Design a protein around this ligand. Structure first.
Ligand SMILES: [Fe+3]
Ligand SMILES: [Fe+3]
Lengths: 215, 315, 215, 104, 440
């Protein structure tokens, strides 16, 4: 069983960028509903119970033929990743480790911002937008994804999360999703969280270079 | 020539760049030894370090998909093989309600094929039929009735090429399940940095939280935080349910991967180490993957890249 | 060049089932945007051509969304709700046993539609683009009413189906009034906004299409 | 192997399915497929639940040396992309429901 | 050039300048052949190599340096070249742990009290509780206020009692299975025989995310470091290839480390059930060669590759792409039972004909008990026939089979292309270079 983890900030800490009413509906019943549905499903099978959270997401994905438990398990992971992906007084310019990595696999931060926005702008329907670290390619990429699927099923480590589900922003921005993406990238995106996520990914990706002797 | 199958290794004095941009021939600026590391296919189940414990009148007739049955004279060739646009006969089928697409088609010219007899026997009553026919659905048995894989190209490592030469009490075990610290925004706690990661992924507000020693707490089901000492290394044993101390506070002769010659001595009271590379290092022994060195004077040409598989008799 | 027409009922006539703000925003800044985008790129023929037998053309999204929105407005009237009658009643009895069974199946399908999408009740008058797809002995039951759920802008007509009634399970259709309480929105729609007259006319049109395809 | 075929190939079995799930699924109005002693090589590129009322079927996946034993009164959902081979040694009759993505 | 070629060799071919410990003869051969064929040796290294050909001279020199011969032999096995920079293992905040029972408890096939299990499983929900570093100061219980009697670990105590019961019940069977399936002992296998000690933790006692104190026991060049963490199975840290050239300076046998369990697996299928990573010291920046899949066993009972690849998480065997889309193909109406129906029909017809008369070869055996002789006889007394009608209805069944499967299929394409899900099974059908009567 997985408990409903609260965001690391008070529900009113994102004002006026994200109003408290959105927080109380996105986490009070939306994220709680996903959590409660999963626990009922996990209470019947002793096999899906026992997997880790990343194991359960990949196991229930079933190689493109998702099990009934996939939607609930994958959605709660995305929301806790979404809450930690935003911090009060976020935005500005990422520094240090994220900085040269962004300008290495994208050319510069300016080319990254336009690439990230187009992924969310062209996302048709409810889905997610990701800045992930490719395990095999050892580089940062921007991936658009629909419904509850996350790049965990591709064995990729997410770094930054954005929710483009309508219920996430239909109160303060409604159908004006274009400015909602810009505000998230300007006042809400947490690059401090991207520090440790790309630090945690360093235990599995090793984005550096080897020291090769001259002999 | 290679006296045994294996892979090539050189340490120094062999040019890494091929003499020609398209070849695999390397030169020796100086004198060096070329090593051959001895070694013994699905590409989906066989992968690196896999341990293999096993070795590698019409109413009487019928028409169906790409085939039909015949109880007008039928002509079949001697070999029983039909060619395209051939004449075999000059209302043959019950005109079934449903008919699928067939590569074969009848115009009687058979154009799109074997032919064998079909005989049905019941209580001695014999009648023969002529059968002319050509994903899982298109299928036209009954349940009722050593070595280790080395991939990078496959080599088998086994005993034919690898051989062995040679508070409460503190105990190794779990210290509990680490929990996420919300100050670091990580689902699974980092617990540690390195000289490259600490410069790369340390936030400004986290500068004061780095510690040069281990400080361990403990939280029970009620949310209380327990340490039992703020300046020592104390953790709780999950099994015996008792506190105990850590080992360090976390502030041999033969090395792994080294190559030996045939009569290299390690001690006066020890047998000579033999040729090969140190594969496994243990408490009191090492396991050696046997290798054969070849002496090569300057100007010699190495026939093969690094780690290239050479069979017996190969130059 | 297609055009967007206002709904055939006053924007204040749907209260409280659908607020005036919700109606005007949904009609004039979702449907209007879809229609104008489709016009910029350039209805049944357009949708079928843009489906392209699976690899959807870039213009498929806007045209399909506009067609589905036009379908949705025609299926709701202020005096809606209740039960249908006549050949529609006999068909619903044959294809669902009882009206309560149909209504509960439709509500369950609408609630279980994960993410953005639609729930459709359509007449099975489909023909496939393959030879040996014709039944020489039709039993008159193969052309029945079925419930289908589709994501994003997909409509059953791409399967050569005949849509009769739809409910917009997109969160933008009801988030302003019912928020995430989808069950309440579905119940209110079913019991107050379902225009059985339009459904009956569409069923008769599907019957006429099947008859004209018979000969 | 230690792992049974159903777990490996993701086959859900609901042996002795109760009436409640049975008429929740709308089994009574599904079409009926019947067969005798035959052998159908099929690939399930769509999901399909199967209710068996009379008869027995042994399922052998492509390349497997073992079989999954299904008796009458069981509800079995054959997964998508399954490469199996049905076997019948007696008259058989079943009810089905081909299901696309989501749905049920 | 001979700077990028060496780097390419290291990265793509696993090259590393491992030290070759040579005998005096091999050392002399290398140092002296660099001068010429038959020439007076002039380079001082060649002169020294010539002098060292006699062990008496070596012993005299060793006595001159005033050292013993044993460590001079041990002096040869010294790592040459530059040394890597020392590790500065800095902790990312304090270590905060909580005793959480493993989620996979109980083991499959083991029955326990459901109420006790549900009481245990309530502790798993504590992962959602947030811990702030600015919070671990208000209620710090140090000393007699942190004694085990004051602990609130009732769920963990229930888990402990159930684990002890399971261990006592299953201890001998696991050892018997290990002896039956594993001929020889290897690091990662079950510690059995005289090497087994009471109190060793079993596999269900562990779970990913646990922090463990252990000792490095085995270094393998192609597998990694093996750490004993107090269990009946050793832990495994995957390191292989070039990484050992530098990591061997820091990860050595006998040292005490802190490790985190990353994965727990079935010992029967996977070679190393417990997979770890080094917390202290941190060598994440030094590990480049990664394992694509965890190594597995190929047992005698494994006769189907698909079953093997499904027991682990390995992709299916690829095949050439047919190039024909599945929904453009024609429907199937040939019921496989018709052939048996055809055989029964011809049998009945031949029996009727014989009764009327007397009131590359394949033989189709058919008895008489599985035929309806009475109906056939009545039909013959009357005169397509019945069996043809049965064939037609069975073909209609197979053809409506086809239509309903096709319609579900088209709905699947619609939904998947609307949501980006794969159409065919991933890991299959790799791209190229990878390897009329009716009128009459
Ligand atoms: Fe969300
Ligand atoms: Fe809409």
């Amino acid at each position: 069983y997985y408990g409903l983890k609260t965001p690391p900030y008070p529900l009113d800490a994102l004002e006026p960028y994200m109003s408290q009413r959105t927080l109380e509906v996105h986490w009070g019943k939306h994220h709680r509903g996903y959590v409660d549905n999963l626990n009922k499903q996990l209470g019947k099978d002793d096999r899906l119970y026992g997997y880790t959270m990343e194991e359960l997401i990949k196991a229930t994905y079933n190689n493109g033929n998702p099990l009934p438990e996939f939607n609930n398990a994958a959605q709660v992971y995305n929301h806790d990743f979404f809450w930690e992906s935003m911090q009060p007084g976020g935005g500005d310019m990422p520094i240090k480790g994220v900085l040269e990595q962004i300008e290495k696999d994208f050319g510069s931060f300016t080319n990254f911002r336009e690439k990230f926005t187009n992924a969310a702008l062209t996302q048709f329907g409810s889905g997610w937008v990701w800045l992930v670290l490719k395990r095999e390619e050892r580089r940062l990429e921007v991936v658009k994804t629909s419904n509850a699927i996350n790049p965990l099923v591709w064995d990729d480590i997410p770094i930054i999360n954005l929710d483009v589900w309508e219920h996430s922003y239909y109160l303060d921005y409604k159908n004006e999703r274009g400015k909602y993406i810009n505000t998230f990238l300007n006042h809400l995106v947490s690059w401090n969280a991207a520090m440790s996520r790309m630090a945690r990914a360093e235990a599995f990706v090793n984005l550096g270079e080897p020291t090769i002797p001259i002999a | 020539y290679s006296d045994s199958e294996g892979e090539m290794h050189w340490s120094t004095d062999v040019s890494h760049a091929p003499e020609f941009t398209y070849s695999n021939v390397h030169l020796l600026p100086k004198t060096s030894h070329l090593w051959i590391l001895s070694g013994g296919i699905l590409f989906s189940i066989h992968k690196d370090q896999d341990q293999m414990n096993i070795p590698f009148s019409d109413l009487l007739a019928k028409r169906r998909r790409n085939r039909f049955l015949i109880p007008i004279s039928v002509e079949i060739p001697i070999n029983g093989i039909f060619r395209r646009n051939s004449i075999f006969a000059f209302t043959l089928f019950p005109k079934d309600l449903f008919r699928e697409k067939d590569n074969i088609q009848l115009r009687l010219v058979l154009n799109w094929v074997r032919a064998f007899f079909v005989e049905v026997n019941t209580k001695g009553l014999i009648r023969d039929f002529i059968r002319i026919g050509l994903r899982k659905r298109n299928n036209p048995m009954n349940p009722f009735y050593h070595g280790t894989i080395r991939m990078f190209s496959l080599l088998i490592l086994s005993s034919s090429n690898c051989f062995r030469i040679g508070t409460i009490k503190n105990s190794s075990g779990p210290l509990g399940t680490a929990i996420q610290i919300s100050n670091f925004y990580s689902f699974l706690p980092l617990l540690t940095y390195n000289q490259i990661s600490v410069i790369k992924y340390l936030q400004l507000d986290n500068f004061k939280y780095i510690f040069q020693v281990i400080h361990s707490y403990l939280i029970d089901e009620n949310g209380r935080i327990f340490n039992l000492d703020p300046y020592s290394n104390l953790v709780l044993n999950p099994f015996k349910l008792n506190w105990y101390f850590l080992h360090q506070n976390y502030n041999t002769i033969i090395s792994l991967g080294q190559f030996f010659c045939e009569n290299v001595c390690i001690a006066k009271k020890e047998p000579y180490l033999k040729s090969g590379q140190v594969l496994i290092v243990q408490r009191d022994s090492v396991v050696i993957r046997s290798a054969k060195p070849y002496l090569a004077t300057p100007g010699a040409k190495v026939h093969g890249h690094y780690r290239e598989i050479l069979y017996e008799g190969d130059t | 060049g297609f055009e967007l027409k206002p709904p055939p009922y006053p924007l204040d006539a749907l209260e409280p089932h659908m607020s005036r703000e919700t109606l005007d925003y949904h009609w004039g800044k979702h449907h209007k945007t879809y229609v104008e985008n489709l016009n910029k790129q350039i209805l049944e023929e357009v949708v079928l051509l843009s489906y392209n037998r699976g690899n959807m053309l870039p213009a498929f999204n806007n045209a399909a969304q506009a067609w589905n929105h036009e379908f949705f407005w025609e299926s709701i009237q202020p005096g809606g709700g209740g039960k249908p009658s006549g050949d529609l009643l006999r068909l619903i009895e044959r294809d669902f046993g009882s009206f309560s069974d149909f209504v509960e199946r439709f509500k369950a399908a609408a609630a279980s539609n994960f993410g953005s999408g639609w729930t459709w009740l359509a007449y099975k008058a489909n023909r496939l683009d393959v030879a040996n797809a014709v039944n020489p002995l039709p039993k008159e039951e193969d052309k029945k009413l079925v419930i289908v759920k589709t994501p994003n802008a997909v409509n059953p007509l791409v399967w050569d189906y005949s849509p009769l009634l739809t409910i917009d399970t997109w969160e933008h259709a009801y988030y302003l009034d019912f928020e995430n309480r989808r069950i309440e929105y579905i119940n209110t729609f079913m019991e107050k906004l379902v225009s059985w007259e339009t459904v009956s006319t569409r069923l008769e049109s599907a019957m006429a299409r099947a008859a004209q395809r018979e000969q | 192997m230690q792992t049974p075929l159903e777990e490996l190939y993701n086959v859900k079995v609901e042996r002795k399915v109760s009436q409640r799930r049975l008429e929740e699924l709308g089994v009574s109005r599904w079409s009926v497929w019947k067969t005798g002693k035959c052998k159908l090589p099929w690939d399930w590129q769509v999901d399909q639940l199967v209710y068996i009322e009379e008869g027995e079927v042994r399922v052998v996946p492509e390349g497997s040396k073992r079989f999954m034993q299904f008796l009458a009164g069981d509800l079995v959902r054959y997964p998508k992309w399954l490469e199996a081979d049905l076997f019948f040694n007696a008259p058989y009759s079943e009810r089905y429901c081909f299901k696309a993505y989501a749905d049920d | 050039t001979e700077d990028e070629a060496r780097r390419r060799n290291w990265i793509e071919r696993g090259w590393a300048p491992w030290e070759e410990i040579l005998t005096p003869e091999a050392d002399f051969a290398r140092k002296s052949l660099n001068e010429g064929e038959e020439v007076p040796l002039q380079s001082p290294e060649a002169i020294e190599a010539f002098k060292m050909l006699r062990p008496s001279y070596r012993k005299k020199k060793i006595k001159e340096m005033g050292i013993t011969e044993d460590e001079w032999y041990a002096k040869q096995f010294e790592i040459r070249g530059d040394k890597p920079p020392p590790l500065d293992t800095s902790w990312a905040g304090p270590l905060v742990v909580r005793q959480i029972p493993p989620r996979d408890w109980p083991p499959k096939g083991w029955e326990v009290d459901r109420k006790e299990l549900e009481f245990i499983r309530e502790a798993h929900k504590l992962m959602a509780e947030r811990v702030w570093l600015e919070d671990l100061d208000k209620d710090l219980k140090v000393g007699e206020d942190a004694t085990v009697d004051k602990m609130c670990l009732e769920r963990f105590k229930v888990f402990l009692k159930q684990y002890n019961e399971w261990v006592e019940a299953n201890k001998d069977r696991l050892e018997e299975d290990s002896y039956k399936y594993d001929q020889d002992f290897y690091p990662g296998r079950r510690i059995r025989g005289k090497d087994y000690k009471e109190g060793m933790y079993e596999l269900p006692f562990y779970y990913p995310g646990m922090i463990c104190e252990g000792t490095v026991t085995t270094l393998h060049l192609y597998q990694g470091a093996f750490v004993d963490i107090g269990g009946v199975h050793e832990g495994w840290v995957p390191i292989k290839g070039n990484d050992w050239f530098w990591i061997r300076h820091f990860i050595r046998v006998g040292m005490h480390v802190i490790v985190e369990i990353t994965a727990k697996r079935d010992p029967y299928r996977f070679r190393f059930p417990l997979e770890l990573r080094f917390v202290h010291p941190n060598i994440d920046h030094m590990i480049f060669n990664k394992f694509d899949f965890p190594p597995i066993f190929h047992r005698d009972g494994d006769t189907n590759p698909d079953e093997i690849r499904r027991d682990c998480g390995r992709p299916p065997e690829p095949r050439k792409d047919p190039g024909s889309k599945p929904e453009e193909e024609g429907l199937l109406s040939d019921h496989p039972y018709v052939d048996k129906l055809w055989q029964l029909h011809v049998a009945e017809q031949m029996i009727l004909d014989d009764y009327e008369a007397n009131p590359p070869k394949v033989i189709l055996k058919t008895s008489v008990k599985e035929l309806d002789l009475e109906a056939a006889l009545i039909e013959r007394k009357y005169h397509k026939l019945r069996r043809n009608i049965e064939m037609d209805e069975y073909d209609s069944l197979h053809w409506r089979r086809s239509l309903e499967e096709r319609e579900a299929l088209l709905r699947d394409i619609s939904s998947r292309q609307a949501l980006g899900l794969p159409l065919e099974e991933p890991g299959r059908y790799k791209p190229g270079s990878f390897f009329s009567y009716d009128d009459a």
